Design a binder for this molecule. Sequence first.
Ligand SMILES: CC1(C)Cc2cc(Cl)ccc2C(N[C@@H](Cc2ccccc2)c2nc(=O)c(C#N)c[nH]2)=N1
Ligand SMILES: [Zn+2]
Ligand SMILES: [Zn+2]
Ligand SMILES: [Zn+2]
Ligand SMILES: [Zn+2]
Length: 390
Amino acid sequence: FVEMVDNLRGKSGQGYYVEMTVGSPPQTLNILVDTGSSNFAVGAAPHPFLHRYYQRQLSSTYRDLRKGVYVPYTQGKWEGELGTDLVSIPHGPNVTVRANIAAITESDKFFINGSNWEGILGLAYAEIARPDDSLEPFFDSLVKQTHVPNLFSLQLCGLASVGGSMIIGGIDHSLYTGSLWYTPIRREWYYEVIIVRVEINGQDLKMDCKEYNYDKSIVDSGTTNLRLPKKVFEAAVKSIKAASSTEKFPDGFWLGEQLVCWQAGTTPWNIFPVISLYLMGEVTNQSFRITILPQQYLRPVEDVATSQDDCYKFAISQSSTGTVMGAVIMEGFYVVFDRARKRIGFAVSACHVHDEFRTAAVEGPFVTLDMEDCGYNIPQTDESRSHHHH
Ligand SMILES: CC1(C)Cc2cc(Cl)ccc2C(N[C@@H](Cc2ccccc2)c2nc(=O)c(C#N)c[nH]2)=N1
Ligand SMILES: [Zn+2]
Ligand SMILES: [Zn+2]
Ligand SMILES: [Zn+2]
Ligand SMILES: [Zn+2]
């Protein structure tokens, strides 16, 4: 898949985008790759931080669905008018499909100054599509209309410019080394997975493993940080603080709200521990671990005021909606979203993050005799229970 290698670009902390074309004649836009949502939505009216947008009036193939959609986030919102148009990925498979498109007509805190993407490609499953699951997501239309295999893979390589690859329909062996380990997709909504054990510099956090997946764990290219449920995040911060106790940092650093700096080239990486997340294996009683270096979770931020200094932001943060394996985790790894086989694969990425003495790793198997169920069952609302799925 040499045509798809290197088809991602981005800015540090503003995700990764792929080129897509919409309409006829083709209007090219840069579209955020988001495995944490399931709408394809594109800016479709002027905005101060956009200089291009989808012009439905210029597409002879555009059809209006005459139905609006409103998508709130805890940080902002976008809203728009649903329709369909022809869509292709110029640096992807050689096919064109008729897909649902939400034309974003207004938004708040969604498009950011200097980001360079004009829309978002929700790669997760219909269940979480807005306004409901009857709006077929892009990848579903892609696989149904063409012979593209039902799989995609992401190599996300670490404002600074970033790059990577989204291989659509395949796995490209040139983008990883060593073993590829698969963990099951627990349920097809988010790319939900189960973490069975967490270690910080080889020391077990020794929490009940349900705490790791409370109320879910998901793989999310739309999230920057590794985000951890409250109790886990506190135990992790306690452990990382212990390891790094030669350095007393301010509270704001541990909150993600303050940089910490050393003289250029002197950062003491050795005092910051590796973190290993052990993911359920395909075989009952087996897991494998993914091991993250501090260079993945301490993100450099170029200081405008101290040229002499290497400065970093702590990129692990607290969650109340479960564990989120964001860019912090993914940047280590070639991640295969094997929708056909309901599994997610992890191998060490060919764009490796370097530490002098340690390596981001994917290792297994680890066997447990004790097969505790580490999944959490989210309390069923009457709202969920009552909707019919015909
Ligand atoms: C998918 C996308 C665009 C959805 C989104 C919507 C809105 Cl309105 C505001 C921010 C985000 C958002 N935030 C990401 C960072 C992002 C911005 C732009 C592109 C990709 C990622 C995020 N990551 C975190 O770690 C975090 C925390 N803690 C909070 N937020 N990601
Ligand atoms: Zn507004
Ligand atoms: Zn531009
Ligand atoms: Zn019914
Ligand atoms: Zn349904």
